[PDB]
Amino acid sequence: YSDRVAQLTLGNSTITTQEAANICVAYGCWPAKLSDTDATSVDKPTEPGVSADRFYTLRSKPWQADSKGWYWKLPDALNNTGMFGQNAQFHYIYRGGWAVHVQCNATKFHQGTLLVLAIPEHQIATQEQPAFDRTMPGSEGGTFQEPFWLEDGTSLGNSLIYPHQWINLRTNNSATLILPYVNAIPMDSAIRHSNWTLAIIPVAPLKYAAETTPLVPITVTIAPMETEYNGLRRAIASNQ
């Protein structure tokens, strides 16, 4: 009856929103565990359960007048966080989906629109091949410099092919996306490869009913979903 009110409970953690639009389920595919027919790695996976399948909140971002956008690689952004981070550090290979929740509230006296992209295999470039601090920026995420080109020589306008929602401040204060695992192989290393990029790009700029511009943060909350890990060894934190 109301797809404007949602509650998301994973593990010991629960999100609510009174202004959602709906929930985007990418490609209509809920995250799912790997079947014996597609699996190759012969060791028995570790499935950590609620210790890792829970919402984690990243540090907030201020939405400024000039903001071009922000992005996070997954699992990259959560590789140093909690028991997800530890399971990803201690295993050679990892698989799983995501529950992404972007929060940004403002007033009925504000206007502005965010585009919230989950982009699979979002390889990035500009006039130059990017360094590690941009390809794998960590929990703090990176920023766009070519938001029009979607950092990749394509166009932002056509990125609605990717799973997305909007945050249009007159309508909603939050976007929710459920992401299945996407890859060309069954499992893959968490430190060497980013399967998804969460991208939040301002399209209509942020305007206030006065010239005094109070602080309007954007906040990202991400839960891993249906995770497996194989290849247990020592903990390795980054591909460097």
Partner: protein
Amino acid sequence: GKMLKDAIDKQVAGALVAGTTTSTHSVATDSTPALQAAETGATSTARDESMIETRTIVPTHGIHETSVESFFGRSSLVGMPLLATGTSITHWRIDFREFVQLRAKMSWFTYMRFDVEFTIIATSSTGQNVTTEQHTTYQVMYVPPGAPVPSNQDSFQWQSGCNPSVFADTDGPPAQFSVPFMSSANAYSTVYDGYARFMDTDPDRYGILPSNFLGFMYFRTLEDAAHQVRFRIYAKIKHTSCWIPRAPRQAPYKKRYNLVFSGDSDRICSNRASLTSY
């Protein structure tokens, strides 16, 4: 016979486009098909019949020219190695990234599983590049990663005991051969958000997925060439599976092994002086 029935697959392109049902006028507060909410990320559900009064239209148009098979299922140039007369040897690194038309067509998808038909046209010419007569056999050898490469025209690597080779004539019909899906992965990847190596984050190994790279084609003439030979390598993609559509490439390609673009003027479509006139 049934055994020959195994080598025949009856396959049909008869999927039609959607039709149109007649509709009449609607004056109500019940049904509001035109009111939408793009914030959800869903595309509009409103149809013709619910927005205006329509007639009935029986569907007659096919969709098969935009099936992924038909869209990729033709040959395109992917390699143009030149065999000079000094060494009479050349090679082409095997990937679909030197020539932009096929690469841009592939950029509509993330993962692609296919077979390949390769077609090789050899052309002989003079130093001033004017067509000339030269009848000679040439050899194309598939050299997979880790096999030693030939260094000369007479290298004993061209024995080809384990590398597959094709021998054809420069002035004969074009060599042609098919190839199954060869990736160690379960699909190829058009784009890769990762590193080619552990313990390394060099920019030159970002976006490099080495499971797309199946090695080299090497080319010699069986004798020393009298004139230079140009091989044109065509690939037709067939038996095609495609996953995860993308925003297609819009900026021109600049490099073979990464997505770098100029991005000096942020626009794609042309400009006008006023939004309310053409």
